[PDB]
Each structure stands twice: as C-alpha cells, then as structure tokens.
C-alpha cells in the first residue's frame, strides 16, 4: 500500500498557494480553481519564453524528511498533449522530474528520495499553450 503522508484534493479544496506568472504573459494566463470540473486549472493562450515564467505551487507544507523515499502522485490532464515540470522540496533544492499528460484524466507517479526537509511541489508550464487541469496531489510512502 502507498500510505498517504499528505493530500490536497481540488475536487473540493480551493486554491491559496504561491504562484508567479511573469509579466510577459500576464494578460493571457490564468491560475485558479475550476469549480465545475472540480480542479486546479492553468490556462494559457500564449507560450511564455521560458518554462518557469508560469510557475505555481500545487502542494506545500510537505511532511517529507531528507533521505527518505516517497512518491509524488498527481492526477493531471490537458487540452492537448504537453509536459508539466516539477520539483518536490524547499526553495533551496528539490527532487526534479516531469509528467507528460494527455487529454484523459490519469494519475502520474514519481518516486524520489527527499533531498531536504519539507517544502512544496513547484510546478512549471510556461511553454504550454492550452488548459492544464490538476485534480489532486499526494505524497505517499510504502
């Protein structure tokens, strides 16, 4: 069993986490809740010049300890095929990876050793044009 250390479930939760849309793409980007689908939604009509120019925490206050093994689980879809970059950890340093999403609601998992104590799920998608939807984020261990 993947025992759940942490969950944020956007099926019901609102969104209050840190996010930063670079001024380059401020007019054409939105980050917030879609209360009909029941998900976090990141919508873009213009690609940014850098992927980190649309960056947002999808989870925070994580109960992770340096050197322990976990999984990050995220349920994601998009309006077209694309890539979500992430890191799990504090601002000093993270365990990094990416998910390649499609138009179906699917769960993605990333196994990692924590590189630090605590932190957040930094998520970046500035190069993606369209709609990204995120249903939940979990941290688990075996």
Ligand X SMILES: O[C@@H]1[C@@H](O)[C@H](O[C@@H]2CO[C@@H](O[C@@H]3CO[C@@H](O)[C@H](O)[C@H]3O)[C@H](O)[C@H]2O)OC[C@H]1O
Applying CB under 6 A, which residues contact ligand X? Answer: 20, 52, 55, 91
Pick the closer one to ligand X by CB: 90 or 130.
Answer: 90
Q: Which is nearer to ligand X, 62 or 75 (CB)?
A: 62
DSSP per position, 33-86: EETTTTEEEEEESS--SSGGGEEEESS-S----TT-EEEEEEEEEESS-EEEEE
Nearer to ligand X, 82 or 90 (CB): 90
Distance of closest approach, residue 52 Cβ to ligand X, in angstroms = 4
What's the closest the beta carbon of residue 124 comes to ligand X, in angstroms?
6
Instruction: Give 7's DSSP letter.
Output: E
What is the spatial distance between Cα 114 and Cα 67, in angstroms, rounded to a whole number?
A: 5
CB of 135 to ligand X, least distance (A): 23
């Amino acid at each position: 069993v993947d025992k759940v250390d942490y969950e944020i479930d956007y099926s019901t939760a609102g969104y209050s986490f840190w996010n930063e849309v670079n001024e380059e793409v401020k007019e054409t980007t939105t980050i917030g809740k879609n209360d009909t689908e029941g998900c976090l939604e990141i919508k873009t009509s213009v690609a940014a010049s850098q992927n980190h120019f649309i960056q947002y925490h999808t989870a925070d206050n994580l109960p992770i300890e340096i050197g322990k093994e976990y999984k990050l689980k995220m349920m994601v879809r998009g309006s077209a095929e694309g890539k979500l970059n992430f890191g799990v950890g504090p601002w000093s340093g993270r365990a990094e990876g990416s998910f390649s999403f499609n138009t179906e609601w699917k769960e993605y998992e990333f196994s990692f050793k924590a590189v630090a104590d605590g932190g957040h799920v930094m998520t970046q998608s500035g190069l993606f044009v369209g709609t990204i939807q995120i249903k939940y984020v979990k941290i688990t261990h075996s």
